[PDB]
Amino acid sequence: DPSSINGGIVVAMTGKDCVAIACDLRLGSQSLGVSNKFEKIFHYGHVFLGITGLATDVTTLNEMFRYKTNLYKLKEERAIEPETFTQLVSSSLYERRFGPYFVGPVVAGINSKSGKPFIAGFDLIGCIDEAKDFIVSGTASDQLFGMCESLYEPNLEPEDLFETISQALLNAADRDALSGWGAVVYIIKKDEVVKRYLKMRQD
Amino acid sequence: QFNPYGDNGGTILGIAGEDFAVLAGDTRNITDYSINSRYEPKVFDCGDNIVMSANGFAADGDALVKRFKNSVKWYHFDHNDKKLSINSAARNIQHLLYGKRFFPYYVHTII
Amino acid sequence: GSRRYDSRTTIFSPEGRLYQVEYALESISHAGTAIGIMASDGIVLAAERKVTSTLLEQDTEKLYKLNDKIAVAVAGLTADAEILINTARIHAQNYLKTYNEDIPVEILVRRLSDIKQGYTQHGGLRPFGVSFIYAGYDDRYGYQLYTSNPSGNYTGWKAISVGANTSAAQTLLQMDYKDDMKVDDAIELALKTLSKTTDSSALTYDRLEFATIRKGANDGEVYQKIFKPQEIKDILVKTGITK
Amino acid sequence: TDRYSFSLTTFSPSGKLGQIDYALTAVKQGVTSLGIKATNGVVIATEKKSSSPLAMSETLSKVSLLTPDIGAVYSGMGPDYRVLVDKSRKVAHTSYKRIYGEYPPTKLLVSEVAKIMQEATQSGGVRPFGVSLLIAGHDEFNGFSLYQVDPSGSYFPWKATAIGKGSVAAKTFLEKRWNDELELEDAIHIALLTLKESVEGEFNGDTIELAIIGDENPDLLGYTGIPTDGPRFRKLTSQEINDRL
Amino acid sequence: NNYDGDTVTFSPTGRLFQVEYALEAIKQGSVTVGLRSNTHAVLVALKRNADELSSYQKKIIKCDEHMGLSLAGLAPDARVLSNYLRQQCNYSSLVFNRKLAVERAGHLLCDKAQKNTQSYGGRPYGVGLLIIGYDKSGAHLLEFQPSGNVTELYGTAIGARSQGAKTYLERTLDTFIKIDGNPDELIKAGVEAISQSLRDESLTVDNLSIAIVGKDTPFTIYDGEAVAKYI
Amino acid sequence: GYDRALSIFSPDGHIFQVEYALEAVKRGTCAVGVKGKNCVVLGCERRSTLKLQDTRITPSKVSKIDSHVVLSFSGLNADSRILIEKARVEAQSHRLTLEDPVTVEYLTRYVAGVQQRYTQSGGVRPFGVSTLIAGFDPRDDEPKLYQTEPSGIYSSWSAQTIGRNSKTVREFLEKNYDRKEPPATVEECVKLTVRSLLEVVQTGAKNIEITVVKPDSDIVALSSEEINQYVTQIEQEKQE
Amino acid sequence: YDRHITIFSPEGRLYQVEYAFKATNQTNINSLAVRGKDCTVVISQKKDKLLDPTTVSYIFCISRTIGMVVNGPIPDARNAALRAKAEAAEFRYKYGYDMPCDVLAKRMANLSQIYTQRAYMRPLGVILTFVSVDEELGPSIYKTDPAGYYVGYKATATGPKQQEITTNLENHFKKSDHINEWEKVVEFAITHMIDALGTEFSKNDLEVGVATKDKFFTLSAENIEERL
Amino acid sequence: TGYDLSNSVFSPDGRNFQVEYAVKAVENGTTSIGIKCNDGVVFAVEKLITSKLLVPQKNVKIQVVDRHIGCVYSGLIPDGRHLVNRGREEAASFKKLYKTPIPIPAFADRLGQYVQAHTLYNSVRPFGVSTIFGGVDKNGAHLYMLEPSGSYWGYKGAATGKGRQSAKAELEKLVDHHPEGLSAREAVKQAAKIIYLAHEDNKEKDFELEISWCSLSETNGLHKFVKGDLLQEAIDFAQK
Amino acid sequence: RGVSTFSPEGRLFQVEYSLEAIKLGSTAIGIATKEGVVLGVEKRATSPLLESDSIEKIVEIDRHIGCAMSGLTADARSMIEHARTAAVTHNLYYDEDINVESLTQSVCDLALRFGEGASGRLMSRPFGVALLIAGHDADDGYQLFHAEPSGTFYRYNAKAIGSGSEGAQAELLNEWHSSLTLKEAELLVLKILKQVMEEKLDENNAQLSCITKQDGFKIYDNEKTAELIKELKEKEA
């Protein structure tokens, strides 16, 4: 299974007028840790994308989406919104219906005009999953589901959302052999984005 | 699951003398244990005092013999009726056989 | 057959000239003037609007953006220019995807020039009747100014003009230009040259397009600013045109 | 068989593309059409001429919906406009909606139409389109917009404009009646007044075509249930035109 | 003349001038004669050389064991047509184990020639051909023109000044018709016929070529000393 | 596609497009190449364009096809760029396939073949460029110079000029270049090249470019100060 | 020149299209189409002892419901008839319901416009009148010309003597749209043609095509005589 | 004026002059005739004996399509052979698709479409032949004539070539005098007579008569040449 | 008028014009004996600075086949590549040397390819260069052929092409006989070249080559040619 070769996990949650997206940092071949500094989260303006799966496919999709977002900004004279970027990701994935990318992309953002946080997840062929609470992806998806269905609350301040998402990520990663060599969290508001690196057991 | 090949049996023998050559062949054609024919020649005179026999799968051998005879005809057409020697015929047959490197004729050839 | 109707757009003349290229240059010589000036700390592009100068013309045609560090001024047919600009944008994005770095200005300019030359040599299609003034920044040479014509030749300039009054503008720019000028001095010189070469009663804000490429201004290393009509009016008042 | 691989549009020694100029002449020989942009809408208007008195002029429409929020009108050659409208609708679907799930903004669709028209002036063995187009639309991030596209593929944004036989007089009239504060009803009235000058025959609801880009129309949306789901483009019936006359 | 530019243009009277120019190219070639009886068919050809230090141009081409031809006009066109005929005969033999009939080969040449006079970008061929053969119907002689017309005749001649040979053949038809079983007599009749088209030259072993096919005779070419006994 | 026969024969046996391409070469700026005892010198004339030209970024006529081989031209600049790109690709391909850099003659033959192919192919026009190709064969200390024309003919030459008033420069070279004793040092070759260029370029020493090619891939483009020094020396020796 | 291929003249005209319009009148035959609010009727004016009369016709059956009448030379007419039949069959296969008359007319007009815009294609010197009884619009007459222009009609006439028939139809409609009556509509159209042109059309001088709700057919000479 | 130099170019009066010139080419050919009898068709043609060296009874003109269609043509014979080959391909395709011999009107339409397609472009030349063809199908006997413009019609009797006027007059008299119709053998005799009468325009050369027929009661609906005693009887009747 | 148009006299315009172009080229002479074939060309240097060693009008097609060219010599490179490929491919396919006549026919078939090929268009115009092909084979001994862009080739005892072809050929008519030795053929080629050349003959303005069954095709060095020129001068005077 190509999706379970390199490992890695990504979570996303909505809190009040804010959003949060977190990822692990491990990159390994099969069971040997190669790199602890492999970030799975990228941003194109104010839209954030986290990709799990094959590291090559992650890098390729990041480069392709940077290409497409730059061209979109040049033609439209405005940055792309999360809701339209979700459709773009879905179409890009479905264009490879038979030779698909083995990826787990997750989109998180805040709509500039409306101010409403937005979150979505995708399978490898571009099926869209819209959620008002959270989205998980990676080799530890079941552990993430278990953590999120218990820790999440419908409305949290960013300070509380940080603790919730960080604890969910850490406790799901400590039960996955292929995940966890460091962890990054992004807290995203209308006019501020904070990035925090967590402390972890490593092994 | 089609198996485009066959066996057809047969046995041929070539011997070179000081001033002569001999090519002999069986005339029996069989499929597995039945006799298709008791007189089906497999040794032919392919012009310019050259004799040829391609033993094995009969269809491939017949196709190869027909192609070599046509090659002799076109060699005569394109080179002012020059006689095709035996080494040149051997090289031409090598090229004819290697032209089907990945779907070969299933025959052993003697000229 | 169709041999009678062929005009043979890619053949030499007995003097060794290409008729279609010369005719396209003559066509360009009747378009709105564009001027590029490079100072020690930035680049100024100024295009004088010529067509569609009417009161009921919303600004919402001559200045375009290629990437975050390269912009162009257009003289000639607008639609052919848009075709070439789309190709250039795709090329810049391809270079960024391949090498994970911003494309040097000269590489993109040379690619566009090769595209232009191809129509001149092979095929039976007319050349592009467009001239470009490129203004860009890269880590190799810093600020760079180029021009390209339908002949496929590209040239780097300290100060250049393309359009209806290239001779007069170039004569004006040969003087009053120094290698140690600043961005504000370059803006003033470009506006003065446009005012002196304009064949109109006054140089108003609604017949101009302005752009600058410099460092800072609520950005990082390099910022591209495309002036709004109000900004153009303020600049005209400040310089001394007051029109 | 088809050996016309060479351009039929070439530069004259004076630097003029003759075929594009001739297409512009064909446009200038066409009937009048107008566009006016108000603060809360856009109006597009044209005259409806009948080839024969026995022809049902209702079966031929000179104003066409491109997208639910974008419509168009023309002056010049009818069949060229019909083919161009088909191509524009197809490009709107295959270039934007199938990629982003949304209809394109007015400016991008105008740019695609302009690209199509430009390709007919440089590719081999073709004649340039002999039409000029006025395109009126609305998009969320830019508001209401009006554009004019020429046979050469040049397009310009207009507060108000006209094309056709009575272009100069209508342009002067619209220049004298622009104030940056008009509403949709004022624009419709001005368009009707300007058309009354350029029409020589009967001036009623059966000889005029009017369309508007205005507010969303939940009645022209044959389903209910999605709060985020409006067709701003609307074509006025002849009865409404007669009432406004 | 504005109607002679290409092969897709009719004249107001309905003439194809490129075809007529190809026919004119034929009319300037060396004379060749074809003749036949009920058992044999013969070709006689007068060669030409550039100068004394040059060899003589070959005029007879073997198509198959039972078929051949002689050319008058543009030689490379004759090579193209002869290669096509060889391919067609080889195809007939390979696929049907059958000897191609002379009439069918004439039809094939007619069809190949017609396509070059109706479409832009191609010229008509510039050579005339005399084709002899022996098949299950006996001996056959055909005349081919680049307009596509193919005719079956007892005897004929093409090239410069071929009219005298044609008149001689027409006068002595009943004689050479019945020369059965005596190939030398038929060859001598053909040589005498081609002697009627000579004005300032005599037949020698260097400028005379002969070909013969027959009931038991494969298509064979004689030149040089092999024709010395027919002069 | 477009495949019209643009280059055809005239009743007198001439191909007019090739002759017109030669006229286009005549309109181009003047380039010169001279052979030394152990070096090759390429000189080029800059057009007296506007003073607002940026020398750093404009293409400099003389292009290195490979670390040991350089090419200059006269005629249309963009066509020359196309030929230069093709030559560079071919040089890399040859170095890949044969594990050795190209010889000067091989690259010259390839470029001439491209030009001839354009003279004979349909739907294209011939290049309006003539070229000079200079260098040293790998591990060889023999200077090599070659000239290529729009028709496709190439030859070696000991000293050759192309473009504009090339006849005056060629007459000067024939009068002043000795086959028996070619210039010994690099300085003498550079002086001869500059003096030959000065016969047509009276607009000063600012519009002269000089490149020196020496074996073991030693290619040096001289600065304007050095060329000015050479020109001042020539001017001083002109009178006394 | 600009008068040989389809490119613009300095006045913005296309001379080849105008010449094709001229070519549409090579046959001196007039045709008339009318609607009866329940059917559509077309009548043509077919006019040598060696010919077989039954093989001479300018009325085609494009499909089960759509009929066509052509004004112009018969080779281009048969070209267009074959093309229209293919288009209707493809439409029915692809979309699962019968092709309507107006959509077919639009498709043929688009093909004509393509001819007027592409150099290597010449226009067809024909005028095409499609008639049917559409399941959504009732009786329908549509007409297309070499310029790529098509429109629907209450009634129409084509040919050299079309002005007289058009004037007579317009006078009838002003007196008073459609005809309020298929046989009666056929007799009305026959009488209209007789009054417009003159003489007495025998059974061999005309051909009649009738389109009803589920069919389009052509009357024989005996049926035409029965009308007379 | 200038409208006659290219195919598929409308003249100001709405004419295509290349097709008319093709008709002129057709008018220079020999006379070909077709007669429709009560249950079949008869085709007759005249072949000029330019030289006595032509082998008699060879050089067949009338051609067969499938096993039930007869074709003859006047004009440029190679064009007629091209058209007949196309018709044979069309008949083979129809038979392969629908497992039935192609009906005569369908074959006529396919030939007409092919001929008409050669008047649509200036890169091709119109066919210079007029073709009389026909046969028998399930509906009965059919006779058609096709012109270079691509227009074709069904006929009671058709004639083409140089002697077309007299042949048409004879055919009209024959049709007028036999309202009920004619039998196949009587049609063969009348075709011989009409060909002999039409040859009287061209008395400069001798001619040979060729006749074929396709009838239900004489050939069981197949096309067959007339070669035996019937041909001699027809010749004797014609010469009487 | 296309590139494949017949004149009213029955000839193709482009082929005749290419022959006119060939008439402008430098002179090449071939002489065939029973001891081998001799080819000779003049090196028409335009300028004194042109290094004559770079002018190569005589090339090797195979060990037993050589060639000389006249006219637009740039067009000859493609044909030479074709001939070399044909010879090598024949050796690969048949393990034997190709006959000279077969190679010449292949070259002529290539030259035909501005129109229809010999087996049923690779260029827009015919070649503007004529070839002298010399060779030896076991079937026909020593052979000399003249090949033209019309697709027609001839066999010659001796032939001359180029600008001075008429006078050189007239001299060849009165000076060739079947008992010529190789050295006599070399001297005759040098004499006729000196007669037809405006410049004074020397080791740099012309070059010679020979084909023998033993040693194959070879091009003489300048020293041997200079010795031959000195011998010719001494014998003549």
Author numbering:
A (entry chain X): 3 to 205
B (entry chain 1): 1 to 111
C (entry chain Q): 2 to 61, 64 to 246
D (entry chain P): 2 to 230, 232 to 247
E (entry chain T): 4 to 234
F (entry chain R): 3 to 242
G (entry chain O): 12 to 58, 61 to 189, 192 to 196, 199 to 245
H (entry chain U): 6 to 245
Relevant lines from the article:
The 26S proteasome is composed of a 20S catalytic core particle (CP), to the ends of which two 19S regulatory particles (RPs) are attached. The cylindrical shape is formed by four stacked heptameric rings, with the two inner ones composed of β-subunits and two outer ones of α-subunits. The multicatalytic properties of this proteolytic machine are provided by the subunits β1, β2, and β5. All active CP subunits are initially synthesized in a precursor form with N-terminal propeptides (β1pro, β2pro, and β5pro) that are autocatalytically processed upon CP formation.
To understand how the pre1-1/β4-S142F mutation affects CP assembly, we solved the structure of the uncapped 20S pre1−1CP. No chaperones or propeptide remnants are visible in the pre1−1CP structure. The overall structural effect of the β4-S142F mutation is minimal. The β4-S142F mutation is located at the interface between β4 and β5′ of the opposite ring. In the pre1−1CP structure, the S3/S4 β-hairpins of β3 and β5 assume the same position as seen in crystal structures of wt CP, whereas the hairpin of β4 is distorted and located near the central β-sheet of β5. We conclude that the pre1-1/β4-S142F mutation prevents β4 from reaching the correct fold in the mature pre1−1CP, despite being located at the β4/β5′ interface and not near the disordered S3/S4 β-hairpin.
